[PDB]
Amino acid sequence: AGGTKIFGFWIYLMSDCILFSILFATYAVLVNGTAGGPTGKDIFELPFVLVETFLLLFSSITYGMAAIAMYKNNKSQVISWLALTWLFGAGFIGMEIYEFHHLIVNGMGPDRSGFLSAFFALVGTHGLHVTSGLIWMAVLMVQIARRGLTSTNRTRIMCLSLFWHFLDVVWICVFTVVYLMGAM
Amino acid sequence: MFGKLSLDAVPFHEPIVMVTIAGIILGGLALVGLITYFGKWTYLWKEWLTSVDHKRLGIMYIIVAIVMLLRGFADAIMMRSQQALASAGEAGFLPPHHYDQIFTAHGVIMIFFVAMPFVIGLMNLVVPLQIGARDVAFPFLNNLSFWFTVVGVILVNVSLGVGEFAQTGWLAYPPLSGIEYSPGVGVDYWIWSLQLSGIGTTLTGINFFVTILKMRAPGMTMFKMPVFTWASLCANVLIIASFPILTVTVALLTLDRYLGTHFFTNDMGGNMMMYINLIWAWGHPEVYILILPVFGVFSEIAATFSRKRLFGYTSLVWATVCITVLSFIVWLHHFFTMGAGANVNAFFGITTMIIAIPTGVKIFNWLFTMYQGRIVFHSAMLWTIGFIVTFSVGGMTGVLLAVPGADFVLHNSLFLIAHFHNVIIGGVVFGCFAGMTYWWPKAFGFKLNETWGKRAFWFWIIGFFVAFMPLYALGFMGMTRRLSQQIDPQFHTMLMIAASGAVLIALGILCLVIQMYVSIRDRDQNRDLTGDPWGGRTLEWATSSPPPFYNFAVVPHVHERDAFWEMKEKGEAYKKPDHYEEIHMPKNSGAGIVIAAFSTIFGFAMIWHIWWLAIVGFAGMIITWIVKSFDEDVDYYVPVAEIEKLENQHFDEITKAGL
Amino acid sequence: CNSALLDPKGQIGLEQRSLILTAFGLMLIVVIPAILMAVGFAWKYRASNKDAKYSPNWSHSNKVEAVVWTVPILIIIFLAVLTWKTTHALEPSKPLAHDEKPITIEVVSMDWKWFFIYPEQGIATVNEIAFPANTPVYFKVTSNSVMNSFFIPRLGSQIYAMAGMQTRLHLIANEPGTYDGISASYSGPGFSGMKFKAIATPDRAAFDQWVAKAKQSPNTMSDMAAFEKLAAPSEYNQVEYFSNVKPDLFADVINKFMA
Amino acid sequence: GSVKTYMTGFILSIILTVIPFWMVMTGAASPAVILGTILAMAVVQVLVHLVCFLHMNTKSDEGWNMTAFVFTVLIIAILVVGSIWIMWNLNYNMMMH
Ligand code: HEO
Ligand SMILES: CCCCCCCCCCCCCCCCCC(=O)OC[C@H](COP(=O)(O)OCCN)OC(=O)CCCCCCCCCCCCCCCCC
Ligand SMILES: CCCCCCCCCCCCCCCCCC(=O)OC[C@H](COP(=O)(O)OCCN)OC(=O)CCCCCCCCCCCCCCCCC
Ligand SMILES: CCCCCCCCCCCCCCCCCC(=O)OC[C@H](COP(=O)(O)OCCN)OC(=O)CCCCCCCCCCCCCCCCC
Ligand SMILES: CCCCCCCCCCCCCCCCCC(=O)OC[C@H](COP(=O)(O)OCCN)OC(=O)CCCCCCCCCCCCCCCCC
Ligand code: HEM
Ligand SMILES: [Cu+2]
Hints:
heterotetramer, C: alpha+beta, Immunoglobulin-like, 5-stranded mixed sheet, 11 strands, D: mainly alpha, 2 domains, binds 1,2-Distearoyl-sn-glycerophosphoethanolamine, binds copper (II) ion, transmembrane helix (chain D), transmembrane (chain D), oxidoreduction-driven active transmembrane transporter activity (chain D), electron transfer activity (chain D), cell inner membrane (chain D)
């Protein structure tokens, strides 16, 4: 019952990993499609990306501490560890919004230079997944605060544990292919 | 009201569209009037519409597929009528504005809303029964997956009346489907019909993958599974691994038309060849999604009506696993003429013919299943013999197309058009009609009419050959696809035979309606009492007809392949237990309909740029998802008094009929 | 039998007809026994036939399952040796070993017509080409619009036409005549009228008279402003001749999407 | 116990992020060695996150939950390398030769 939904969500993440690989294949084809505009070296500020990498890494271990507290009967420590990985995930989203807002204002949006289309569709699709997991984390936080660590709530923590750690796995492929290969 | 809706979007001063609009509105209001005349609104709700039962959901998938088969055929009869008139020098009805949305709609409806729900509906009805399961792994997700397909058929049907459909072909190739060559709402109707239905079938593939792996009966290993379950397992793998490609590819087309991005454009660094690479990376596994459970349907039918065990089970299983892996490495054969080199074209040409090898293993294993049996010529057996003759012709044709040098003169020809109708009508449609006839007593409790079912076969067989063997000849003559006006008179008298064969297919659709009417009219006489109307071998026929809504009072203990056949041979086969236990079953949920109702509002508002309605439609789906998560009344227990009433009324029909 | 693919007039089409015939013959050794066993076993092993043997428990045979795997493997192996040799021989953009000074024709897809440029002769045409018989023709194909497909069915292979891109095709005609060419990729409302005539002249004397006829026309294509005047959307265009063309006009059509 | 695996996989992933970031931001006197070490540490850090965080195991769902991941890695490698090789040959052709 619990393991059936957890295994079923793992199959969904395998289909979600194939979804991201199409964006990676589209990015690799279109990376040289700069229509006289900026390239990767003219855009990517690597100290800014390094802070974003650590914020998703800090939220990855923070969800692990929430899962550890779920394996004991500490309801209060699950909520407090879930509150810290929400703040680290909201810091990751806010830096990506600040990165995208600076490009759109400076005329480097997705509608110019179709390398920029592939950049906004891969980083933006990952940020939509982190935003989707941030809404799910807030819904799960109010369910544990109302109902406790019930059997349905413990399965949802482990389903989001698969989802949240998967987004840090995808981001490892993102800053490697997009940012670090682009800024060489 | 707002956005681009202006009442000039409704195609007035266009009589062909307005007659079919009034035929669906008045045909739909008469359907509404019959439910309120009989008082069945509280019966369709709480038993059918909110049903988490896989048998109810499996039937409704086929009902959608059969209804959309009528629309997808009635515009295919208009292309045959137009091409017969356009040749021999008449510019009759169907202008190119009218004609070009017809093959786009015919391609979309017949792939996504005819062949896909019929294949999924046969897997929904049968696969939990064949493995000893009581339901699917995620029963609310199965109900939600059905209603996302309904959102797809609503959006294509309102494009008939509210706006227009796409004029790009059924796969919507770039720049012609771009915003500077298709500025209208037709591609937007194509985008959101495929996106909202495509997320429904993705959840279907996950649901049946977990059900086959985790919800099996005790003692049934993987190589003791039924062959239809093996074929359904490999078909759901291709759903999980390829329908994400369709989700990204249509979403990248969405960003081009809505946000002005450059993915598949000509000007600002976009690459239009990337979409055609991506749309066929999904595109060929989609056609192996359609044909794989059809291979599982024909393996059960050929074993049942030969009264013989299925020949070469291990070879048939590993041929299915060989197909589900080789389906992902062949997709460049759809664009051999794009301009890739000799190394790329020969590599994908060679491996396209490699996948013909496990298909030939399956064909000859069915031939030796009937090699020394006692063949009973049922209607479903007639579709099986007619499949082997038909699929061998169009399958051989595709291997000829797999050679790039042969494909350089046959690409986008009527030879290509005749190829894939040969393996869909011959393969999928014959398989869907065979499995419909085979599992009709299990779904409803009575048998279909045998006389009108055979006449439906004889019109669908060589009536197809009159329809599409001229298109084989026309593909050699040089006639290309999607030709509408001023067709060459040399192509006349071969388009005239193909139009005559479409009339014979129309009589076979009419024979299906007569077969369904006569069987319902005489269901009290042709009643299936024991639950095994034929000599059945799999665990589906161990139940009553229809199954008792939990499918199994006690889950069966499987020891061998063809578990119900071994029970009948060992002599037990019908054993009343001394006691029964309570059965944990899921509850019917009104959500899923509500999530889909907000999604068709969201889809319609995205097409017509009604941005406030799109936010309300999108937030309605998310809030209904969130408020469903707080529900704790998801399951209940079936009492033993309910079970003993259903089991004792099955075991006295076993007593009356000899057993 | 006399239908432009079983009766081809070019060397590429004649080589492709033998490729179709050898492939169809090779697949007939497994498909014909599959169809004949489908009708033959159904007739012989009826339930009403009391003379046939009945073996309900026979489901495994090592000798039978060896043949069911071997013969499709051996046919596809023979169908993969060719499909490797013929793919490298019938590939477009590979020039024909003929040594008779190939004539280059530049092809532009429009909405909805075919624009042809003769850069060595300085001649531009609409919906009609001419070339000598038994001389190689080098086609440089592009699009000004959505994707089309350049196809002369009686002469050989087809190739896609894409905007900003230059596909290459080599054809030759063995007999003089006029062959209808079409667009083989759907491109919009005027797609049914994208038909041209490819005239193979008996010799280069009759080809030079057609070029001299086309340079007597008063219309020219000396600038891209005259090109975009022609590239305005139109359907079912007649044959039109242009006497003076821009020397690098084909590169200008490609560079309006790549720059 | 399980705190040790989360802490070791956190220490490793800090090192496996700092070194590829430092090599681009310094220069490291070689372009090809940087690209090799960046892709090597990207694969290693993915494998650390699968074991330490996602708790991947060969015996988790009776052999499954790992063969499903191995299958999708092969599908992704077929889809990505296959599309890149197709689009490289399509773009090497269709040029003004
Ligand atoms: C579900 C339907 C379906 C099925 C079953 C198939 C099966 C095959 N497809 Fe057909 N495809 C299908 C659906 C399509 N394919 C298409 C287009 C298409 C093209 C493009 C050609 C072109 O662009 O002009 C090629 C090369 C093929 C190859 C094949 C091959 C080799 C098989 C093989 O799997 C067939 C294998 C079966 C055989 C071979 C017969 C059985 C074997 C016997 C009897 C003995 C063994 C014999 C041998 C091994 C030789 N497919 C299109 C075009 C879409 C569009 O254009 O818009 C569609 C819809
Ligand atoms: C364009 C953007 C579109 C985005 C649409 C979707 C994202 C919007 C926000 C969704 C997040 C909130 C959803 C609700 C949160 C709480 C649900 C819950 O309890 O989750 C646990 C659930 C296990 O299920 P169970 O415990 O049985 O309860 C069933 C709930 N009805 O576990 C589950 O299996 C359910 C939760 C799974 C969540 C899936 C993750 C969504 C990923 C969306 C991708 C976003 C970007 C895609 C872009 C398009 C493609 C390029
Ligand atoms: C799909 C491909 C594209 C991806 C992007 C968009 C889709 C994102 C959402 C996908 C969610 C996938 C989750 C699948 C998990 C399956 C296994 C699992 O954990 O099951 C949990 C549960 C199953 O439920 P069940 O067991 O029947 O009982 C329910 C009790 N409440 O499962 C559930 O009931 C919860 C999940 C069902 C609810 C999801 C429905 C909302 C989806 C809206 C998408 C909106 C996107 C719009 C834009 C399109 C793209 C541009
Ligand atoms: C292997 C899976 C099988 C395939 C899946 C199903 C696909 C085809 C769908 C048709 C089958 C549904 C109907 C069969 C159910 C049995 C009928 C029945 O129980 O009778 C109910 C009703 C009258 O009986 P009543 O007196 O109310 O109750 C007594 C019951 N002994 O009898 C009636 O007269 C009402 C029956 C309801 C029919 C509504 C279904 C609509 C189907 C539309 C498909 C296309 C129809 C084409 C045009 C028909 C109209 C001319
Ligand atoms: C938003 C605008 C657009 C709307 C789009 C349409 C939405 C999707 C609709 C899909 C759902 C179809 C409805 C399914 C009802 C099928 C009922 C049926 O077949 O059974 C009737 C019942 C049979 O008797 P029994 O044997 O008890 O049934 C169990 C068998 N396992 O017999 C009985 O005893 C009772 C008889 C009453 C049943 C009458 C109901 C008529 C069928 C409804 C219309 C179906 C045809 C049209 C479908 C259009 C699909 C696009
Ligand atoms: C039952 C009788 C059917 C007939 C008479 C028929 C007829 C036609 C015709 C005339 C065309 C257009 C040919 C051209 O473009 O020159 C076509 C295209 C097509 N058909 Fe069918 N069809 C039938 C069934 C089906 C079915 C069951 C499917 C299921 C998948 C299907 C899928 C398609 C597709 C995908 C196309 C191409 C769409 C496009 O060109 O955009 N057809 N059909
Ligand atoms: Cu294919």
